[PDB]
Amino acid sequence: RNTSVMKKGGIFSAEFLKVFLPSLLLSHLLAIGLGIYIGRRLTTS
Amino acid sequence: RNTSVMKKGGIFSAEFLKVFLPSLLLSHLLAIGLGIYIGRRLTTS
């Protein structure tokens, strides 16, 4: 019956996703590292 | 000409850094949250 998995936009090509993967991983790792640091500032500040 | 005040982009994936640009920043906020969780996993969690 229901057959709806709504494909919208994001990254149109996986090849472009490859190109972006360094800057993607870097920015997310920055955010994770920052989160760990923020975790520390919530307890020891 | 480039010696002129231009509203210039010319990015790799024109679609990605429109349709997913807010969601990208949202997932960084998500990653910071995840960072806090792995931060507590390191200590008391």
Curated annotation (Swiss-Prot), chains A, B:
Could you tell me which cysteines form disulfide bridges? none
Superkingdom as given in the UniProt entry:
Eukaryota
* TM spans (from-to): 19-39
UniProt subcellular location: Mitochondrion; Mitochondrion outer membrane
Q: How does it assemble?
A: Homodimer. Binds to BCL2. Interacts with BNIP3L and ACAA2. Interacts (via BH3 domain) with SPATA18 (via coiled-coil domains). Interacts with BOK; promotes BOK oligomerization. Interacts with PPTC7; this interaction promotes BNIP3 degradation.
Family, per entry? Belongs to the NIP3 family.
This chain's function reads: Apoptosis-inducing protein that can overcome BCL2 suppression. May play a role in repartitioning calcium between the two major intracellular calcium stores in association with BCL2. Involved in mitochondrial quality control via its interaction with SPATA18/MIEAP: in response to mitochondrial damage, participates in mitochondrial protein catabolic process (also named MALM) leading to the degradation of damaged proteins inside mitochondria.
This protein's name: BCL2/adenovirus E1B 19 kDa protein-interacting protein 3
The organism is: Homo sapiens (Human)
Q: State the gene name recorded for this protein.
A: BNIP3
